[PDB]
Short mmCIF file of C-alpha atoms in Angstrom, two decimals:
data_model
loop_
_atom_site.label_atom_id
_atom_site.label_comp_id
_atom_site.label_asym_id
_atom_site.label_seq_id
_atom_site.Cartn_x
_atom_site.Cartn_y
_atom_site.Cartn_z
CA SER A 3 -0.06 -0.01 0.18
CA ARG A 4 2.76 1.94 0.11
CA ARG A 5 1.66 3.91 3.16
CA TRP A 6 4.80 3.48 5.19
CA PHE A 7 6.28 6.63 2.91
CA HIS A 8 5.75 9.94 5.07
CA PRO A 9 6.20 12.89 2.50
CA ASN A 10 6.41 15.72 4.86
CA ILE A 11 8.16 14.84 8.07
CA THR A 12 11.47 15.67 9.75
CA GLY A 13 14.13 13.18 11.36
CA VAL A 14 13.15 13.84 14.86
CA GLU A 15 9.76 13.93 13.71
CA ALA A 16 9.92 10.21 12.40
CA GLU A 17 12.09 9.10 15.92
CA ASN A 18 9.41 10.97 17.96
CA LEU A 19 6.49 9.17 16.12
CA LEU A 20 8.36 5.82 16.13
CA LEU A 21 8.90 6.03 19.83
CA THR A 22 5.68 7.26 20.27
CA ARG A 23 3.25 4.86 18.93
CA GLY A 24 5.55 2.00 17.45
CA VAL A 25 7.87 -1.01 18.05
CA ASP A 26 10.65 -2.67 17.68
CA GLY A 27 10.47 -3.45 13.95
CA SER A 28 8.68 -0.81 13.18
CA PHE A 29 9.82 1.23 9.96
CA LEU A 30 9.11 4.08 7.87
CA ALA A 31 10.71 5.99 5.13
CA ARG A 32 11.04 9.70 4.56
CA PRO A 33 12.23 12.26 1.64
CA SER A 34 14.56 15.40 2.25
CA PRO A 38 17.58 16.84 -1.32
CA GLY A 39 17.39 14.32 -3.62
CA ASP A 40 17.81 11.06 -1.31
CA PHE A 41 15.80 9.17 1.05
CA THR A 42 15.81 7.77 4.21
CA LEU A 43 14.45 4.81 5.91
CA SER A 44 13.86 5.15 9.57
CA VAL A 45 13.96 1.90 11.75
CA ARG A 46 13.15 0.80 15.35
CA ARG A 47 15.72 -1.43 17.05
CA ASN A 48 15.89 -2.41 20.89
CA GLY A 49 14.25 1.11 21.87
CA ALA A 50 16.44 2.99 19.72
CA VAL A 51 15.51 4.14 16.27
CA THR A 52 18.19 4.02 13.00
CA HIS A 53 18.36 6.03 10.15
CA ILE A 54 19.66 4.21 6.90
CA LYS A 55 19.55 6.44 3.74
CA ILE A 56 18.78 5.57 0.34
CA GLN A 57 20.41 7.60 -2.77
CA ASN A 58 18.94 7.62 -6.09
CA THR A 59 21.47 9.34 -8.78
CA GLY A 60 19.09 8.39 -11.32
CA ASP A 61 20.39 4.44 -12.02
CA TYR A 62 19.02 2.39 -9.13
CA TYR A 63 17.77 3.33 -5.29
CA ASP A 64 20.80 2.14 -3.23
CA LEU A 65 20.20 1.73 0.16
CA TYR A 66 23.82 2.48 1.69
CA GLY A 67 25.63 -1.13 2.94
CA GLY A 68 22.61 -3.16 1.02
CA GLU A 69 21.25 -4.00 -2.14
CA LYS A 70 19.68 -1.69 -4.80
CA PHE A 71 16.48 -1.58 -6.08
CA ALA A 72 13.80 -0.21 -8.94
CA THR A 73 11.27 1.08 -6.21
CA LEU A 74 11.25 2.38 -2.29
CA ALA A 75 8.61 -0.60 -2.04
CA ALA A 76 10.78 -3.52 -3.96
CA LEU A 77 13.39 -2.40 -1.02
CA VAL A 78 11.26 -2.49 1.79
CA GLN A 79 9.48 -5.88 0.41
CA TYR A 80 12.76 -7.15 -0.09
CA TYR A 81 14.02 -6.51 3.36
CA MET A 82 10.88 -7.37 5.26
CA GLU A 83 11.30 -10.77 3.58
CA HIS A 84 14.57 -11.23 3.78
CA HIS A 85 15.98 -10.20 7.59
CA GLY A 86 19.44 -10.69 8.70
CA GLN A 87 20.52 -9.02 5.12
CA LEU A 88 19.85 -5.20 6.85
CA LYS A 89 22.79 -5.39 9.49
CA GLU A 90 24.61 -2.71 11.25
CA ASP A 94 23.78 -5.85 15.19
CA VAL A 95 20.68 -6.99 13.24
CA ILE A 96 17.72 -4.42 12.22
CA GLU A 97 14.24 -5.92 11.46
CA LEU A 98 11.37 -4.15 9.17
CA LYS A 99 8.67 -5.67 10.74
CA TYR A 100 5.84 -3.39 11.01
CA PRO A 101 5.59 -0.64 8.62
CA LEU A 102 3.91 2.36 10.00
CA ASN A 103 1.25 4.35 8.39
CA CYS A 104 0.82 8.16 7.03
CA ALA A 105 -2.42 9.91 7.29
CA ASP A 106 -0.89 12.82 5.20
CA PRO A 107 -2.96 12.09 2.13
CA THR A 108 -1.04 14.93 -0.40
CA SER A 109 0.04 11.76 -2.46
CA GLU A 110 -2.77 11.03 -3.51
CA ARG A 111 -4.49 11.48 -6.91
CA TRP A 112 -8.29 12.12 -5.24
CA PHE A 113 -6.87 14.48 -2.91
CA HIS A 114 -6.94 18.13 -3.92
CA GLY A 115 -6.17 20.13 -1.31
CA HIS A 116 -7.32 23.96 -0.56
CA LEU A 117 -9.40 24.05 -3.31
CA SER A 118 -13.35 26.02 -3.13
CA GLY A 119 -16.81 23.80 -3.73
CA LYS A 120 -17.62 26.09 -6.94
CA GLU A 121 -13.82 25.11 -8.51
CA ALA A 122 -14.40 21.40 -7.69
CA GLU A 123 -18.05 21.39 -9.24
CA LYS A 124 -16.54 23.32 -12.54
CA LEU A 125 -13.82 20.83 -12.71
CA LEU A 126 -15.68 18.15 -12.10
CA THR A 127 -17.96 19.23 -14.72
CA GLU A 128 -15.15 19.92 -17.13
CA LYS A 129 -13.34 16.65 -16.92
CA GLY A 130 -15.34 13.86 -14.27
CA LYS A 131 -17.33 11.69 -16.26
CA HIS A 132 -19.43 9.31 -13.62
CA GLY A 133 -17.95 8.09 -10.52
CA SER A 134 -15.05 10.77 -10.91
CA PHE A 135 -14.44 12.29 -7.25
CA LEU A 136 -12.53 14.15 -5.28
CA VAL A 137 -11.71 15.27 -1.93
CA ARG A 138 -10.80 18.90 -0.91
CA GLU A 139 -10.53 21.20 2.41
CA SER A 140 -13.85 22.56 3.24
CA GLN A 141 -14.42 26.04 2.99
CA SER A 142 -17.24 26.39 5.23
CA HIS A 143 -15.63 24.97 8.76
CA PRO A 144 -12.14 24.81 9.26
CA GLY A 145 -10.42 21.47 9.99
CA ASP A 146 -12.93 19.07 7.72
CA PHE A 147 -12.53 18.26 4.50
CA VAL A 148 -15.52 17.70 1.91
CA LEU A 149 -15.74 14.60 -1.05
CA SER A 150 -17.30 15.34 -4.49
CA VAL A 151 -18.45 13.23 -6.18
CA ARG A 152 -19.91 13.19 -9.94
CA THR A 153 -22.82 10.81 -10.94
CA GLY A 154 -24.88 10.15 -13.96
CA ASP A 155 -24.99 9.08 -17.30
CA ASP A 156 -23.02 9.62 -20.39
CA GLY A 163 -29.54 17.39 -17.10
CA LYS A 164 -28.46 14.00 -17.14
CA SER A 165 -25.85 13.85 -14.38
CA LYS A 166 -25.29 15.48 -10.95
CA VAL A 167 -22.41 16.58 -8.55
CA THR A 168 -22.69 15.57 -5.13
CA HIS A 169 -20.90 16.77 -1.62
CA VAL A 170 -20.34 14.73 1.17
CA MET A 171 -18.97 16.65 4.64
CA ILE A 172 -16.38 14.75 6.38
CA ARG A 173 -15.47 16.19 9.77
CA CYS A 174 -12.53 15.68 11.59
CA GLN A 175 -12.87 15.14 15.08
CA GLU A 176 -10.13 14.19 17.35
CA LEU A 177 -7.74 13.77 14.53
CA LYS A 178 -10.61 11.07 13.27
CA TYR A 179 -12.48 11.47 9.78
CA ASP A 180 -15.77 10.58 8.99
CA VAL A 181 -19.00 11.33 7.01
CA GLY A 182 -20.99 12.02 10.24
CA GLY A 183 -22.13 8.72 11.27
CA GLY A 184 -20.83 5.49 11.34
CA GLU A 185 -16.90 4.55 11.08
CA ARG A 186 -14.30 6.61 12.05
CA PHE A 187 -11.19 6.09 10.43
CA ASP A 188 -7.81 7.07 11.12
CA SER A 189 -6.74 8.90 8.04
CA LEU A 190 -8.94 10.13 4.95
CA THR A 191 -7.31 7.40 2.71
CA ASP A 192 -8.83 4.91 5.08
CA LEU A 193 -12.44 6.48 4.47
CA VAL A 194 -12.04 6.93 0.68
CA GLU A 195 -10.89 3.29 0.70
CA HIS A 196 -14.13 2.30 2.69
CA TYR A 197 -16.80 4.37 0.95
CA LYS A 198 -15.00 3.47 -2.55
CA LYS A 199 -16.02 -0.43 -1.31
CA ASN A 200 -19.04 0.14 0.59
CA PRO A 201 -20.19 3.21 -1.70
CA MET A 202 -22.65 5.48 0.17
CA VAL A 203 -26.04 5.50 -0.85
CA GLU A 204 -28.72 8.44 -1.04
CA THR A 205 -31.96 7.96 0.31
CA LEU A 206 -33.48 7.81 -3.06
CA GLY A 207 -31.05 4.78 -4.78
CA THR A 208 -28.47 6.33 -6.40
CA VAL A 209 -24.99 5.45 -5.55
CA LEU A 210 -22.06 7.68 -4.72
CA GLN A 211 -19.90 5.28 -6.73
CA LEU A 212 -15.93 6.42 -6.27
CA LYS A 213 -14.54 5.15 -9.49
CA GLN A 214 -11.67 6.85 -10.28
CA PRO A 215 -10.51 9.93 -8.90
CA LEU A 216 -10.29 13.59 -11.39
CA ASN A 217 -7.15 13.70 -13.72
CA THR A 218 -5.19 16.50 -12.93
CA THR A 219 -2.60 15.89 -15.41
CA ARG A 220 -3.80 15.78 -18.58
CA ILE A 221 -2.32 18.37 -20.29
CA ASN A 222 -2.60 20.18 -23.46
CA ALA A 223 0.94 20.59 -25.67
CA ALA A 224 -0.08 24.16 -26.17
CA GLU A 225 0.22 25.18 -22.59
CA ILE A 226 3.26 23.29 -21.77
CA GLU A 227 4.98 26.58 -20.84
CA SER A 228 2.72 27.73 -18.93
CA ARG A 229 2.09 24.10 -16.78
CA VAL A 230 6.16 23.89 -16.34
CA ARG A 231 5.96 27.22 -14.36
CA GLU A 232 3.02 26.30 -12.24
CA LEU A 233 5.11 22.85 -11.21
CA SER A 234 8.54 25.12 -10.96
CA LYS A 235 6.70 27.55 -7.84
CA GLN A 245 7.70 22.36 -5.40
CA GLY A 246 4.92 21.16 -8.02
CA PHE A 247 6.84 18.60 -9.69
CA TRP A 248 8.25 17.32 -6.40
CA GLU A 249 4.24 17.37 -5.72
CA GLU A 250 3.11 15.87 -8.73
CA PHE A 251 6.39 13.24 -8.77
CA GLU A 252 5.39 11.67 -5.21
CA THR A 253 1.84 11.53 -6.78
CA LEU A 254 3.19 9.22 -9.41
CA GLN A 255 5.34 7.36 -7.01
CA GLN A 256 2.84 6.13 -4.66
CA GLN A 257 1.32 4.30 -7.12
CA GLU A 258 4.32 1.79 -7.68
CA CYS A 259 2.87 -0.61 -5.68
CA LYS A 260 -0.12 -1.52 -7.95
CA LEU A 261 2.63 -2.58 -10.59
CA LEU A 262 3.76 -5.71 -8.20
CA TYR A 263 3.92 -8.30 -11.03
CA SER A 264 5.33 -11.36 -11.30
CA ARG A 265 9.40 -11.75 -11.83
CA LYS A 266 9.79 -15.33 -11.49
CA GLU A 267 11.87 -16.25 -14.30
CA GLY A 268 14.28 -13.46 -13.99
CA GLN A 269 14.66 -14.74 -9.97
CA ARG A 270 15.73 -18.17 -11.32
CA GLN A 271 19.31 -19.68 -10.15
CA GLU A 272 20.10 -20.52 -13.47
CA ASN A 273 19.70 -16.37 -14.51
CA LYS A 274 20.87 -15.18 -11.63
CA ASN A 275 24.80 -14.51 -13.53
CA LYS A 276 22.60 -12.54 -16.02
CA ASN A 277 21.49 -9.47 -14.20
CA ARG A 278 23.56 -6.56 -13.70
CA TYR A 279 21.72 -6.57 -10.07
CA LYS A 280 20.04 -9.10 -8.71
CA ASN A 281 17.21 -7.00 -7.60
CA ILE A 282 16.14 -5.69 -10.83
CA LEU A 283 14.62 -8.07 -12.72
CA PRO A 284 12.10 -7.94 -15.85
CA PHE A 285 8.28 -8.24 -15.74
CA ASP A 286 7.41 -12.13 -16.89
CA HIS A 287 4.48 -10.50 -19.08
CA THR A 288 6.96 -8.13 -20.91
CA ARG A 289 10.31 -9.41 -20.89
CA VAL A 290 12.47 -10.91 -24.30
CA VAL A 291 12.07 -14.70 -24.54
CA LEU A 292 14.96 -15.79 -26.68
CA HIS A 293 14.47 -18.81 -29.03
CA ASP A 294 16.86 -21.04 -30.91
CA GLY A 295 19.23 -21.78 -28.31
CA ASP A 296 22.06 -23.56 -27.19
CA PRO A 297 20.40 -26.72 -26.00
CA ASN A 298 23.48 -27.72 -23.93
CA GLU A 299 22.43 -24.21 -22.23
CA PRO A 300 20.15 -24.82 -19.28
CA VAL A 301 17.86 -21.87 -19.70
CA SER A 302 18.82 -19.93 -22.48
CA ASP A 303 15.54 -17.99 -23.32
CA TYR A 304 16.38 -15.31 -20.38
CA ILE A 305 17.56 -11.75 -20.83
CA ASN A 306 16.97 -8.66 -18.80
CA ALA A 307 14.68 -6.77 -20.74
CA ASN A 308 11.47 -5.67 -21.48
CA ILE A 309 8.87 -5.06 -24.47
CA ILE A 310 8.22 -1.25 -24.06
CA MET A 311 4.47 -0.81 -26.17
CA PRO A 312 3.24 2.49 -25.76
CA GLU A 313 -0.60 2.35 -25.18
CA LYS A 324 4.00 4.28 -33.53
CA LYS A 325 7.19 2.08 -32.81
CA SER A 326 8.08 -0.11 -29.73
CA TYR A 327 10.72 -0.67 -27.90
CA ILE A 328 13.08 -2.80 -25.72
CA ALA A 329 14.68 -1.39 -22.47
CA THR A 330 17.41 -3.55 -21.37
CA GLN A 331 20.58 -3.36 -18.96
CA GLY A 332 23.81 -2.71 -19.89
CA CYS A 333 25.41 -6.05 -21.64
CA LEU A 334 27.80 -8.34 -19.16
CA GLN A 335 30.66 -10.25 -20.68
CA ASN A 336 28.26 -13.17 -20.42
CA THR A 337 25.17 -11.76 -21.42
CA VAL A 338 26.78 -10.20 -25.15
CA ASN A 339 25.67 -13.31 -27.06
CA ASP A 340 22.35 -13.34 -25.79
CA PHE A 341 22.10 -9.32 -26.48
CA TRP A 342 22.80 -10.12 -29.73
CA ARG A 343 20.66 -12.66 -30.29
CA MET A 344 17.64 -10.53 -29.00
CA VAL A 345 18.64 -7.86 -31.44
CA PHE A 346 18.45 -10.42 -34.42
CA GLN A 347 15.28 -12.14 -32.95
CA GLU A 348 13.30 -9.19 -32.43
CA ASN A 349 14.50 -7.50 -36.14
CA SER A 350 15.91 -4.62 -34.11
CA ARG A 351 17.93 -1.96 -36.47
CA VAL A 352 18.41 0.99 -34.05
CA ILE A 353 20.42 0.63 -30.55
CA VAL A 354 20.49 3.81 -28.37
CA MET A 355 23.11 3.53 -25.50
CA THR A 356 22.57 6.05 -22.99
CA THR A 357 25.80 5.66 -20.84
CA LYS A 358 29.63 5.26 -20.96
CA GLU A 359 31.38 2.03 -20.72
CA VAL A 360 32.84 2.65 -17.64
CA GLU A 361 31.65 5.80 -15.31
CA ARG A 362 32.91 6.96 -11.53
CA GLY A 363 35.39 4.39 -12.17
CA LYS A 364 32.83 0.99 -12.23
CA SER A 365 32.06 -0.58 -15.45
CA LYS A 366 28.33 -0.09 -16.35
CA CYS A 367 28.00 -1.86 -19.67
CA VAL A 368 30.95 -4.00 -21.59
CA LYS A 369 31.89 -3.09 -25.44
CA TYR A 370 29.59 -5.56 -26.76
CA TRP A 371 30.32 -4.24 -30.44
CA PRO A 372 34.08 -4.42 -32.24
CA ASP A 373 36.14 -1.85 -33.21
CA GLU A 374 35.97 0.09 -36.17
CA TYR A 375 36.45 -1.67 -39.18
CA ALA A 376 36.26 -5.27 -37.38
CA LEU A 377 34.51 -7.89 -37.45
CA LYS A 378 33.67 -10.04 -34.29
CA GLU A 379 31.84 -13.27 -33.65
CA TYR A 380 29.34 -13.18 -30.47
CA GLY A 381 28.54 -16.72 -30.23
CA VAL A 382 26.19 -17.81 -33.44
CA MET A 383 26.01 -14.07 -34.21
CA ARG A 384 28.63 -12.06 -36.66
CA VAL A 385 28.89 -8.34 -36.52
CA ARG A 386 30.92 -5.95 -38.57
CA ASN A 387 31.25 -2.51 -37.56
CA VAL A 388 31.17 -0.51 -40.57
CA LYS A 389 31.75 2.85 -39.90
CA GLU A 390 31.79 5.26 -36.54
CA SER A 391 30.43 8.94 -37.16
CA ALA A 392 31.34 11.19 -34.04
CA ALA A 393 28.99 14.22 -33.30
CA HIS A 394 28.76 16.29 -30.35
CA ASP A 395 26.89 14.25 -27.81
CA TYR A 396 26.87 11.15 -29.57
CA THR A 397 29.05 8.66 -31.90
CA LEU A 398 27.22 6.75 -34.38
CA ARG A 399 28.22 3.12 -35.67
CA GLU A 400 26.82 1.59 -38.44
CA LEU A 401 26.89 -2.23 -37.76
CA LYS A 402 26.64 -5.21 -39.59
CA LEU A 403 24.23 -7.91 -37.75
CA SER A 404 24.92 -11.75 -39.52
CA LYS A 405 24.18 -15.38 -38.56
CA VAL A 406 26.94 -17.25 -38.87
CA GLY A 407 26.91 -20.22 -41.05
CA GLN A 408 23.86 -18.69 -42.73
CA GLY A 409 23.61 -16.28 -45.97
CA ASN A 410 20.89 -13.55 -46.56
CA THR A 411 20.37 -13.04 -42.65
CA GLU A 412 22.77 -10.10 -42.55
CA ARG A 413 21.08 -6.27 -41.50
CA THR A 414 22.63 -3.20 -40.60
CA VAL A 415 22.04 -1.79 -36.87
CA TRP A 416 22.46 1.74 -36.15
CA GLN A 417 24.08 1.91 -32.84
CA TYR A 418 23.81 5.58 -30.88
CA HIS A 419 26.09 5.78 -28.47
CA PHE A 420 25.25 9.16 -26.17
CA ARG A 421 28.01 9.98 -24.71
CA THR A 422 27.73 13.36 -22.57
CA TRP A 423 25.21 12.17 -20.28
CA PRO A 424 26.68 13.41 -17.00
CA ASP A 425 27.42 11.10 -13.88
CA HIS A 426 24.91 11.97 -11.56
CA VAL A 428 20.92 14.85 -15.60
CA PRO A 429 21.73 17.52 -18.90
CA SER A 430 20.91 21.25 -17.76
CA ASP A 431 19.56 21.80 -21.13
CA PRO A 432 17.76 19.24 -23.49
CA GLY A 433 18.80 20.55 -26.63
CA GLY A 434 20.96 17.68 -27.19
CA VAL A 435 18.63 14.88 -26.35
CA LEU A 436 16.56 16.13 -28.44
CA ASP A 437 18.57 16.55 -31.76
CA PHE A 438 19.62 12.88 -30.34
CA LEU A 439 16.22 11.35 -30.48
CA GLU A 440 15.69 13.76 -33.57
CA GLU A 441 18.07 11.64 -35.45
CA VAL A 442 17.15 8.29 -34.00
CA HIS A 443 13.45 8.73 -35.06
CA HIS A 444 14.35 9.40 -38.05
CA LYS A 445 16.86 6.61 -38.93
CA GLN A 446 14.17 4.05 -37.24
CA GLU A 447 11.40 5.37 -39.45
CA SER A 448 12.99 5.05 -42.48
CA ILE A 449 14.02 1.42 -42.53
CA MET A 450 10.73 -0.74 -43.33
CA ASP A 451 9.55 -3.70 -40.93
CA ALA A 452 12.56 -2.74 -38.40
CA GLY A 453 11.74 -3.90 -34.85
CA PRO A 454 12.15 -1.78 -31.47
CA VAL A 455 14.23 0.21 -30.88
CA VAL A 456 16.54 -1.01 -28.11
CA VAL A 457 17.45 1.36 -25.31
CA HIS A 458 20.12 0.68 -22.98
CA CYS A 459 21.91 2.32 -19.76
CA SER A 460 23.39 0.36 -16.91
CA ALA A 461 19.95 -1.15 -15.07
CA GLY A 462 17.70 -0.18 -17.66
CA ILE A 463 16.27 1.72 -16.05
CA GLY A 464 16.08 5.61 -15.01
CA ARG A 465 18.22 6.84 -18.00
CA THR A 466 16.69 4.62 -20.45
CA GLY A 467 12.81 5.40 -19.06
CA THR A 468 13.44 8.83 -19.70
CA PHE A 469 14.72 8.35 -23.06
CA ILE A 470 11.95 6.66 -24.15
CA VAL A 471 9.28 8.25 -22.07
CA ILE A 472 10.43 11.68 -23.71
CA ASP A 473 10.32 9.58 -27.21
CA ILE A 474 6.70 8.41 -26.55
CA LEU A 475 5.77 12.04 -25.58
CA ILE A 476 7.78 13.88 -28.66
CA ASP A 477 6.53 11.23 -31.31
CA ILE A 478 2.77 12.42 -30.11
CA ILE A 479 3.77 16.33 -30.62
CA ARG A 480 5.56 15.50 -34.11
CA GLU A 481 2.05 13.29 -35.43
CA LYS A 482 -0.70 15.23 -33.70
CA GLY A 483 1.03 18.64 -34.02
CA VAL A 484 1.36 21.31 -30.86
CA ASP A 485 -2.39 20.50 -30.40
CA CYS A 486 -2.73 17.60 -28.34
CA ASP A 487 -3.17 16.05 -25.07
CA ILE A 488 -0.42 14.87 -23.02
CA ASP A 489 -0.24 13.26 -19.84
CA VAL A 490 3.33 12.84 -18.80
CA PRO A 491 2.65 10.78 -15.33
CA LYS A 492 0.07 8.85 -17.19
CA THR A 493 2.47 7.77 -20.01
CA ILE A 494 4.82 6.77 -16.80
CA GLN A 495 2.86 5.24 -15.19
CA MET A 496 1.63 2.98 -18.46
CA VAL A 497 5.48 2.39 -18.72
CA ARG A 498 6.23 1.39 -15.37
CA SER A 499 3.50 -1.22 -15.78
CA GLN A 500 6.01 -3.09 -18.72
CA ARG A 501 9.46 -2.63 -16.63
CA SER A 502 9.59 -1.88 -12.84
CA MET A 504 10.89 2.97 -15.46
CA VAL A 505 11.83 6.92 -14.45
CA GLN A 506 13.78 7.11 -11.17
CA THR A 507 14.34 10.26 -9.57
CA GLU A 508 12.59 13.50 -9.82
CA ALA A 509 15.41 15.29 -11.56
CA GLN A 510 14.75 12.89 -14.76
CA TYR A 511 10.94 13.50 -13.85
CA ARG A 512 11.65 17.58 -14.36
CA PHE A 513 13.90 16.99 -17.49
CA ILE A 514 11.31 15.06 -18.90
CA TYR A 515 8.92 18.03 -18.64
CA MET A 516 11.34 20.67 -20.01
CA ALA A 517 12.39 18.31 -23.15
CA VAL A 518 8.53 18.21 -23.85
CA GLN A 519 8.90 22.32 -23.37
CA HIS A 520 11.89 22.93 -25.81
CA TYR A 521 10.44 20.61 -28.34
CA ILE A 522 6.95 22.64 -28.65
CA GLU A 523 9.65 25.63 -28.12
CA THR A 524 11.39 25.24 -31.43
CA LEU A 525 8.27 23.09 -33.41
CA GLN A 526 6.59 26.59 -33.54
CA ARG A 527 9.38 28.27 -34.79
CA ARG A 528 7.59 29.37 -37.90
#
């Protein structure tokens, strides 16, 4: 439920809150700038472990790396003994009552503004919660019902008594989230048969592409942080299975043992070595925007290069996007899976020739020839695009990435029957999710024009459902700045 995450809380606030209303084994996560802190109670004391996210993964210091904070909490809740200094136990998640991260919580918002927004954007079952105009401390839940003078908007008061919230009778809830969850499953019914069904909240995020310049400023005075945290709170809905990645036969095929591909979107390799026990696995996912598709994969390991070229050949991909150097900050992020210029290498059953390397300002283009060893009429050209100027920890200007994606999209579109654009970095999420999400957004704007509706968090959530994708708030802000810059250069007429 991720409610163990407390957005607006200080360090000593967490300690007192864990000591007064918690026991040994209780924990909560808190943000405060760019990293996070996991406060855990242990033997009457409270310890603070830090998680650092540089845009590639969540790195719990002294522990493992994870794709989401919920995966970090879930892992250490099932793997007690590996989170040590003395043993530290993640037993009881302490839940937060602050509803700011909820989509249905609009916070400060009047009654007429809620009726207008529920009229313009809401359908049957759309609801919201706001701070009450009439009486301080209390709240109001406004819900729209009808057919799609055939509909109405009903307001329900939610008074706050001794830190508990209720409808005026019946159950009293610890938080507004619990009240919403209950009356969402047990909906209130008016005395005349109509049922106040809470279907889906109001979408305060679908933006028209022409107004991007104003919305970025509305989130700049933090708006970006509040919207990103709302998007982060939905990660518990994307806890799909990853059983094929957790197999002991595939343990040595992942760059990080806890960043695994979803089973329903992973790339399954065929026609493999019968002597190898498992030859169908690769840390990669088919990214389908819900018009090109993508393959988000990890950086190559020395023992996964042959499988990597099997994947490109099998999926008929013709364009690769590398968004990291081989080595960054002294550590290997992706082994060199391509031959030297003018060379010809054999990667298991696949054969790759590096025909030419062209150096641009921010990237290097390599024209590769992928063919099947011992086979004719299998050769095809794979255009590898290696972005080399991404910072170690986002670019201050999106001009290079947009030029990079423009040349990548034009080459992909020029090859008929071309497979998904393979995009990878170190772990395959963060930088990779940023590039793919931006490319989806500018592709909509390039086709439908500057008068089309976009939704950055919804699009991200759609992509995060296919790979466990965007990492930090900085990348989230960079996606907006890239969309804004793309609109700005397209309107030069």
